[PDB]
Design a protein around this nucleic acid. Sequence first.
DNA 1: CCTCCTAATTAGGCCATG
DNA 2: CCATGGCCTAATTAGGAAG
Lengths: 80, 84
Amino acid sequence: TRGRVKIKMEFIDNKLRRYTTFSKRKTGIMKKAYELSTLTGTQVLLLVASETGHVYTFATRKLQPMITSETGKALIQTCL
Amino acid sequence: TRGRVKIKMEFIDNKLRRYTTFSKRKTGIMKKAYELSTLTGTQVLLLVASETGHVYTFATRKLQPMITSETGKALIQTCLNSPD
DNA sequence: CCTCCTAATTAGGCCATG
DNA sequence: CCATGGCCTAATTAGGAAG
């Protein structure tokens, strides 16, 4: 097919494409976080919130409280 | 050269090789974070802590306070410095 | 601590499905 | 409706090893 197209760095107006891009890139960066974490053994935290009010997150042991602790969850919710 | 190599998902014992990977991977995931954020217009928060203790971070407008505030910064500090 | 040669690896449309 | 999930290719991204 046309292969991967060089998308211009800008907000995708087409709701369809925007959402489609989100799911893919969301999964991508999530794996990247996992990889960086395990490979170098460094503490990583990732939080992504979709328009659909979904909060996809990834956190390392010592950083989990940021999203798990009531205190952290509160801050997160406040920011959103 | 040989090209890119299939790195087995595990802790890189070779400290120098490890940090080399970290430097690239880090800047890469940071780029991704920016791209996803600006592209889809969604809120993103990234936090990466090196062995050296450096806390490299990135966050979208709404999430900035998470890393730039007494409450936010404190929480980050507590986690990193609390027993495991 | 922050380029080169290449292969590993994401994604982009697009359509399909839970 | 929304979120993935392949398919087919092409744009990136990191190893390894040096600058």
